[PDB]
């Protein structure tokens, strides 16, 4: 509703059946290694290694589910409090910004929501496990309802936003009305006129503005 | 195909409130160790809260659009067998008429 945000969120159960190394870690926007599901819970705020297990488990009777959430707890036992947690994400506080901001942001990236960022993260590590314990068919990446398709609107949307883009940082140069007017027009023109959906002049989902067919009405 | 159309984009707020006003416990005041039959809410991939008996919740809604108080493109779906309730104001959805 304002961006494109290409920062996607990974959360993987290490160790296959017969490995007892089944540590659950996560890889997060702007952070190299993968962070134990536990560490990330503490830098959130949920601190007692067990306090967290109610965020994961929506019925503390899935004994087999809990028995896997065991290593991770010891995996990230070495860090116990909130402070300790995000220094391992490296003054170094910067980690609180990165969680607050570029992370699970389809929620709000106002700080104060630290309890639906977690009660979600769990909800993810939850659904992951139902498939590990064959009480779930892994989803259908070829499932249509799960696919969206932009039409002309959204497609101008990306272009118009990413266009007005370096319009306003060109007007930030009118200091150091008489602003630029061509670039919004000749921009829009370009893409609707190349099919290489603009993006300045570097190509990019080429072949998206196609000239209409006229050999019969039906066609 | 012919009778297919496509979603336009509707707004979410005036229904995430229509939930607060019909059975939705936000989660900062949620821990499941007193409520496991807690069914979950989803609007465009956001978990806003929790409700108990969805019966007349998902069925007071399904006659809410039917009369027009909610927009007819948004799609409402609860998964009994997994106690979840996803709602999409999304823009991109390929609805058919039935």
């Amino acid at each position: 509703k304002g961006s494109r945000f290409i920062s996607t969120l990974q959360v993987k159960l290490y160790g296959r059946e017969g490995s007892s190394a089944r540590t659950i870690k996560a890889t997060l926007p702007y952070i190299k290694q993968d962070i134990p599901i536990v560490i990330i819970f503490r830098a959130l705020g949920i601190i007692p290694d067990g306090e967290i297990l109610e965020h994961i488990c929506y019925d503390v009777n899935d004994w087999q589910m809990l028995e896997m959430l065991k290593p991770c707890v010891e995996d990230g036992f070495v860090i116990q409090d909130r402070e300790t947690a995000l220094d391992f994400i490296g003054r170094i506080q910067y980690a609180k910004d990165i969680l607050q901001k570029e992370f699970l942001p389809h929620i709000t990236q106002l700080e104060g929501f630290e309890s639906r960022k977690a009660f979600f993260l769990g909800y993810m590590i939850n659904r992951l496990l139902l498939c590990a314990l064959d009480r779930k068919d892994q989803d259908d990446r070829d499932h249509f309802g799960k696919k969206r398709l932009d039409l002309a609107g959204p497609l101008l949307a990306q272009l118009f936003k990413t266009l007005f883009k370096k319009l306003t940082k060109d007007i930030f140069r009118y200091m150091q009305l008489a602003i630029n007017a061509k670039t919004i027009t000749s921009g829009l023109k370009y893409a609707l006129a190349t099919g290489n959906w603009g993006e300045q002049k570097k190509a990019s989902r080429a072949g998206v503005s196609q000239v209409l067919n006229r050999y019969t009405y039906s066609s | 195909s012919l009778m297919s159309c496509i979603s336009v984009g509707t707004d979410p707020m005036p229904i995430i409130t229509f939930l607060s006003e019909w059975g939705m416990e936000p989660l900062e005041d949620y821990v499941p160790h007193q409520s496991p039959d807690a069914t979950r809410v989803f609007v465009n991939g956001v978990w806003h809260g929790v409700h108990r008996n969805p019966a007349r919740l998902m069925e007071t809604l399904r006659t809410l659009r039917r009369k027009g108080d909610i927009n007819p493109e948004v799609s409402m779906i609860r998964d009994i067998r997994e106690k979840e309730l996803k709602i999409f104001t999304d823009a991109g959805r390929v609805y058919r008429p039935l």
């Binding site: 304002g2 609107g153 007005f164 | 496509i6």
Partner: peptide
């Protein structure tokens, strides 16, 4: 798609302070 673009979701993109916008 175009209408809903033009009408509303075009205005949304105004964030020396920009306000309501008209197209001919």
């Amino acid at each position: 798609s175009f209408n809903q673009f033009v009408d509303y979701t075009l205005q949304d993109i105004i964030c020396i302070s920009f306000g309501k916008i008209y197209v001919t």
